[PDB]
Amino acid sequence: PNIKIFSGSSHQDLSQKIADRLGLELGKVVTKKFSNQETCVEIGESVRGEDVYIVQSGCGEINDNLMELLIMINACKIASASRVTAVIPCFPYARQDKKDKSRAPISAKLVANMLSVAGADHIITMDLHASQIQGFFDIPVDNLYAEPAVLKWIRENISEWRNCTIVSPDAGGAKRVTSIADRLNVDFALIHKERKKANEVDRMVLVGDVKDRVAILVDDMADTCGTICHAADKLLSAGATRVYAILTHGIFSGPAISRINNACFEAVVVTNTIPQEDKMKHCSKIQVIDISMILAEAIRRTHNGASVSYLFSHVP
Amino acid sequence: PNIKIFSGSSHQDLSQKIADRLGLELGKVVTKKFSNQETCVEIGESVRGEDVYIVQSGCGEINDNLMELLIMINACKIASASRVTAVIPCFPYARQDKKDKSRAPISAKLVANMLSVAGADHIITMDLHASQIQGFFDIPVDNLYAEPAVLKWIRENISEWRNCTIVSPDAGGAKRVTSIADRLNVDFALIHKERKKANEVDRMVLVGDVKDRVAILVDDMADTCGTICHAADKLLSAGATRVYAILTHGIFSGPAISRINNACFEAVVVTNTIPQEDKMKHCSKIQVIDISMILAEAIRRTHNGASVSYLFSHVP
Amino acid sequence: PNIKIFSGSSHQDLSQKIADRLGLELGKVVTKKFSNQETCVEIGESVRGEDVYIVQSGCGEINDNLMELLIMINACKIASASRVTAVIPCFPYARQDKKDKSRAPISAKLVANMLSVAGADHIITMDLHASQIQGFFDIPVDNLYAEPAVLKWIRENISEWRNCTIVSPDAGGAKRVTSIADRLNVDFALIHKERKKANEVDRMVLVGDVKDRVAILVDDMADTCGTICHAADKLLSAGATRVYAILTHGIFSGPAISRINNACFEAVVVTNTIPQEDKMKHCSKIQVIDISMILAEAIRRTHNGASVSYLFSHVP
Amino acid sequence: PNIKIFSGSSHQDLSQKIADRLGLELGKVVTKKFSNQETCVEIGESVRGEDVYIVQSGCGEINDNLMELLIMINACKIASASRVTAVIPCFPYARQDKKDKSRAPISAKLVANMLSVAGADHIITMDLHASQIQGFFDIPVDNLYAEPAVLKWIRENISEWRNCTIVSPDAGGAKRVTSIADRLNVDFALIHKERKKANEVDRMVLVGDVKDRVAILVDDMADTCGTICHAADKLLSAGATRVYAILTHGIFSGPAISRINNACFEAVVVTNTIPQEDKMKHCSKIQVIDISMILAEAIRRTHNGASVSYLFSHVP
Amino acid sequence: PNIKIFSGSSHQDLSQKIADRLGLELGKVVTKKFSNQETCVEIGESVRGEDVYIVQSGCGEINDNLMELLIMINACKIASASRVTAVIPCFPYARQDKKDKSRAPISAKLVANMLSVAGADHIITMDLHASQIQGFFDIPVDNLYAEPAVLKWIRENISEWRNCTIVSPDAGGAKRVTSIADRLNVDFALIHKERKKANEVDRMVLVGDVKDRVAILVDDMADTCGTICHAADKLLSAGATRVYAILTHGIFSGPAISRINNACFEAVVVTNTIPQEDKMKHCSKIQVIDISMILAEAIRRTHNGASVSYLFSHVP
Amino acid sequence: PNIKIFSGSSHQDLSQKIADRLGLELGKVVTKKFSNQETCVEIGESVRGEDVYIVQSGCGEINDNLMELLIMINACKIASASRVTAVIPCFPYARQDKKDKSRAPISAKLVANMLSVAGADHIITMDLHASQIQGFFDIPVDNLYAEPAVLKWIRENISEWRNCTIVSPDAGGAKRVTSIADRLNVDFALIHKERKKANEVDRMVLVGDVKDRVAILVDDMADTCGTICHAADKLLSAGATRVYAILTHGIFSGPAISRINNACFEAVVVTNTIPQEDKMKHCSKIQVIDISMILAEAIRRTHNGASVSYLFSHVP
């Protein structure tokens, strides 16, 4: 079997980068819409007995892209592909990973079941919102970390990183922030927005010392940037000299760009798990860490039957 | 268990009509989008041990609506509903019902598998593009006919219906047209657009006599109205006095409204399996047959454990 | 893995032809009946890690043959075959492909489920009664066409084929007839037997002109030959000079042979998806198109991981 | 839900007896064959939300009957039956319950999988050839014993039963014979036909004393009656005064009737799990124990949610 | 259907409390070991059509208890129970909820799959180590919180609770601690043990102010009490006046009792999701919050088809 | 793919013997217990695309070992092993192979389902208590016989084996004893312990002649040795000169060692499907037949795609 890399409509630049790093051309696929807005998928080459990797991030037109991915997976399976792997850099519906409300769906589990029934044999993803999403499948799920790439960026772009403090913008980010602070041998802090019992002012509590130090906000994603912007205001109010925000998934939906442009961030750093070209044109603060080498190495090692553990300590 | 009727975002007027005919209020659901365009479903009441019917047509934002339906089905199942029925008046991806091309997906089968894995126990639909789609599920699938409603409209709105000829706009509609012509005891004709071997003019062949008679075009759907418009030009060129078009699914995507407005149709008749309010505002030729009573009777009989065979001979 | 071709009891001559065209000997199998008429299957060689193809048509003792096929598939799967493919030239129960009656089974779907649970990984079949039967499986299903072979026979055996008209014996055959007429660039006609509302005479309506022309009846199968015989009487009554019947599946059950012998057919042409040796001995009108090369090429390309699209335009 | 009893073509007299004992009429079903010998099943009434019991023994046209049963189960499931139970008095392919030969199928497991995929929720059967066949399903399987009925017949029809010896015709029947001998407080013996190493005379070894005593052969089934006839010759050669044969499944296929008529049996006693009317007309030695009351009580208790343990100690 | 409560060997006192609160006697079960240490389960009453709840905590002989639970679930399913619910107060293998190491199993997912294949229809559990474990099943999973009971204990047993600080013993507990601190309107702190890069001294970093205040350690479980004991030493070194530890799962395996007896805890508070009678006899610091009313109310509401949302705000 | 042999904690000496006979080192696995007695499995090497064989007998801590095996299978599957085979020399819960009691579980079927859901693709086992357990899986199950090894031991260690009688200790062993007696061309006898109707003395009935002959007791297993010890007393009381006991599974749980030491056995012969080192230290009568060559040959032939039928006639 040979590696066949197919791109959905979501992140074709990332698919191209992965294919170039693998020394391959992208597989021939036409991914369009019928007139009635139904997804049209036209695989333009044989995948018989091939090791098919379909790159599709959960971003942009989320349901459009997920349906595109499912249809492409099913087409490859029925076309007798040896193995179909869904390379999903940003897993859609990952934040709907539990039922903590009455009648609430576990949409991440539904997406996992849909991918399984479409015929996916393997999932490659980066920085799942909850790592337990790996357990939502009965197939192997590669949950790659952007943490080695983040540490590289911090050590190369922040002069006073050895005296910085890594700040969690919410309680759920504490593990990620503590891991990064341990790897950098720096202090960490946590910011919590307390629960909205009524319609008074949202107030943020900070635990840890950030006074007269550079604060680096690290989180898994910035959707509306309410979390990071509120954390940035709190950090400046607490005496932080400079505030950075580093995310792996830059969703930047809704008012995020205006929020960042009016915030105090020295830089907002995201990976290219989601296309950022449009976002960077309206926000100069955004910088992008390319993770295409990580995904390409993961795909290559999966095809060659080699461990991907190397990707959790080094940036290829 | 009690009937709980929940509406998706696709066709809420039809859901309201069904609920009124059942003497029920629609179940409390908030069906919106998160900022990143992920589907948000918030069922606002208990469905524990309830007989849940979710009405969602395949129309409008097709993938949005299908994801909404799947998430609502899964939420109801995890919320311990006694039974979850997907009422899908127009089945999405129904035209992708076979693999007659290399690497082509069977998207209808994928949609069926997705509905099954979401937890649907029963499907109620009207005039499947292919009746074999019933076989795409392992659960009961009700394929209701709009044919009794069509015959009623013909007998009440076309004065010379006894001398009319029912015309198939393509080869695939022949069974539907022959059934309607048999029930009306009238002649039938078939129109075929021959295959596009090169870039010459599309030419249509008509088999059957339509000269100096009213021609009624009957088809399962009109998406772009290319089929019915080309058939209408052919029918007028063949000497038909007046031309009607009767569909059960009025999709009317893309250039359909301009095509119909510039066509020669006496009337374009569709059911309300798809919302038509917007379409009727720009095309006076469109008339709507309400099928909400058929769907409501089907839901009521399904809940009561009664046969729906009555719906195939009478309009309630 | 190597190709292993195993024959059921249904069509062993076709299995032999396929094996010869593949340059192989048929796999050693004893397919008999126990005393109590239970199917006895004794695979006489190892199939470990082999690519097993089991040839069994739906014909003759239908349930006997289907049980034989299921038992052989399961034996091969438990015997650790790398892949088990059911080569079913005529799919049994294919006409029971929908539920258009109360309490009616979808027997084609049940057969598909039985084949899936027996362990079939791939289905190769010719001219499914409904192409949507491909969607009854979750495994790849090859629906080969006899159409290229039919066109070859028409062009080589009917002198006036360029002025002929291809006739559908019922409404359901319209797509097949229009496709053949398009490929031959000839006229087409359709014959419909209207529905039996009471016990009066069956009357047939013909749409299209067949007067003073050769009429070629093309259908997917002739079971009792009531359809083709009634169509032939109608065609002669309408002024057809000569009438041919071309089918892909010659079932010829019940009174079919006497019907054909007393009909006006110039020739009844069938493929050898079903054994015809016995039928030809009692009806001189029957001629057979060998499709063993099509099936052998399909098996060879499936084993080699090559597209079978070539089989839809050429006869190997 | 109400009990609906449907009969297949195999044993309709037993179905009638069960229905009468349940105070019910048999459900309306037409079970015939299409012209091409495909099974035709036409359920003539609604089974929506009903507790459906389908009676079909593995006998006669075995594959015909099993396909009939599977099609009826699937039709009832798709017709929205509350529960479908297969009442299979003699389980087909039960003797193919293991793989003790190369490439041998486990046909009993395949039949179980086929019943499961057809949609059976419950199996009721009598005296499985191997009780482990219960483990071939993931649904409850009732393995009823004819042993209480056998003991009743022995105590009422054999005057010297207290001095009799119960004889196993092969090694596999030892458990059944020891159980019966324990319940009767009588001696037991075992007869073994040693393995056929070459083409010499089949010789039988008897362990136990049968001299000058009545010998009762007890086995689960008599297919060709080779086992019981050879055992009977051995028992007479060993000095048995009279020889009885008691089976629960009288298959009597092939040469069994001539074998019994030429044997020395005082009586051959079978249950009516298989129809015996034809067999009794050609062999006066055959007597029938009616087990319809056992099956009817099992069905009634299954419907009422009551234990069937009472059936293992008493004959209702 | 009626509620049937069955106890495994793990926590029979809790099962008794649940049954008493439900006004029921525990179902008759013998749960012992065969001589070869295989689990022996003997359900002593009919569960036909019953709503069966099996109470079995993951504690004590973990694999013994889990096998007991699986065997009891399967026995109830095969015994035709209407519904089988596994009441697992402490979910076993819950800490193995992801693959963050090469070749690491997701044992929680395996346990979920085993429960699903045993036939569980519903899971009721308290304070899952990861709430995403709900997504490891395709059945409803009730993840009850001990948080209302913890808050009650704090408000009734700690006089200076309004000036206390709730302390997370690790980064993963941050969400739980922030939720509790929000509900109490008190400060929170977090303690992190940094990663063991080499064999130097384990050092703990504290973020937040605990000086001259009562510190309440809140975590989901205390297995070896290394986390809470190290956190307690850090808290005293940081100037905390008194230190409490509140857990929901008191596992107290290995050296935990000696660790607590030599620690500085004012009280170690656990729920009775795990039996604590033996632990309290050797450690006077341990106090137990009874959660049997929460579990009993959850079971009762599940049986009655009522929401369990009330249990997340009130202690019944 | 390469053979990877992994050992569980149950029988590591047998795993070592298998690996040596295969010319391999055992795969690196740490199989320990967490503090709370949960099974900890740490596979120490890549199994990507490997043919993994996990050796784990059902013995010792039965539930511990079975959970270990399931966790290791699941870890290998998620670690992308090409194929995972469970080598289970003594199948746990094999004696719970049917439901012959009210509410009784079929624990063997549950174990099979658990192995299937863990991801096992193949099972290799020796002398299943019931061969129908092969039918409890949908994957190939190799049921190897120790019979060739037993016959070798008898012919090499019992001087008067040609005049011996092979004795079944119960009715269920009759097939095994008759097969062995046929292969040795010797007499056989059967011993039955009649059913315990009340609390009187257990009495044993012997059928067959053992007077003044060596008696060889052959059974599938000796758990408590009650069966073989009672049979030995009966055989001596019946005039047997010497009594041997040959088993394939020596469980020797509970009072078995004291029973054997106080019995009259010339030798108790078992295979090493279960570790016997501890048992032999307290009972000099126990001798061990090494079957590691049989298991190693089975694994090697499974990997090489060769028949294992040779193992049923010869000891490698």
Ligand SMILES: Nc1ncnc2c1ncn2[C@@H]1O[C@H](COP(=O)(O)OP(=O)(O)O)[C@@H](O)[C@H]1O
């Ligand atoms: N150091 C690590 N940190 C986090 N996750 C890891 C780590 N090592 C492995 N994983 C997880 O395990 C998966 C597979 O691990 P890998 O080392 O590539 O080999 P294997 O597939 O045999 O376990 C990765 O995709 C990742 O999800």
Ligand SMILES: Nc1ncnc2c1ncn2[C@@H]1O[C@H](COP(=O)(O)OP(=O)(O)O)[C@@H](O)[C@H]1O
């Ligand atoms: N006359 C008919 N024409 C077409 N389809 C039919 C007809 N009668 C029944 N069906 C199909 O069968 C389904 C169920 O049939 P119904 O008569 O309601 O009872 P049952 O569910 O017991 O079969 C319908 O939803 C429809 O798909």
Ligand SMILES: Nc1ncnc2c1ncn2[C@@H]1O[C@H](COP(=O)(O)OP(=O)(O)O)[C@@H](O)[C@H]1O
């Ligand atoms: N005494 C028995 N001997 C043999 N099989 C039995 C016996 N009792 C029960 N069974 C088996 O168990 C099945 C169901 O048992 P039953 O006592 O009716 O209640 P439950 O279904 O709750 O176990 C029966 O159909 C039969 O297969």
Ligand SMILES: Nc1ncnc2c1ncn2[C@@H]1O[C@H](COP(=O)(O)OP(=O)(O)O)[C@@H](O)[C@H]1O
């Ligand atoms: N306030 C809440 N906090 C956390 N989990 C909750 C909450 N409300 C509901 N849940 C979760 O949802 C499950 C079921 O919710 P419930 O309100 O009882 O009704 P429903 O089952 O219809 O959703 C609970 O068992 C729990 O896991």
Ligand SMILES: Nc1ncnc2c1ncn2[C@@H]1O[C@H](COP(=O)(O)OP(=O)(O)O)[C@@H](O)[C@H]1O
């Ligand atoms: N002589 C035999 N006696 C008993 N069981 C056998 C015998 N031959 C084969 N089997 C069974 O069949 C299985 C596989 O058989 P084998 O001859 O190795 O080839 P195949 O897997 O192709 O059937 C064995 O593992 C065993 O369970």
Ligand SMILES: [Mg+2]
């Ligand atoms: Mg979250």
Ligand SMILES: [Mg+2]
């Ligand atoms: Mg967050």
Ligand SMILES: [Mg+2]
């Ligand atoms: Mg179509």
Ligand SMILES: [Mg+2]
């Ligand atoms: Mg069309």
Ligand SMILES: [Mg+2]
């Ligand atoms: Mg048809």
Ligand SMILES: [Mg+2]
């Ligand atoms: Mg036809």
Ligand SMILES: [Mg+2]
């Ligand atoms: Mg047998």
Ligand SMILES: [Mg+2]
């Ligand atoms: Mg026998």
Ligand SMILES: [Mg+2]
């Ligand atoms: Mg954790």
Ligand SMILES: [Mg+2]
């Ligand atoms: Mg922790």
Ligand SMILES: [Mg+2]
């Ligand atoms: Mg047994």
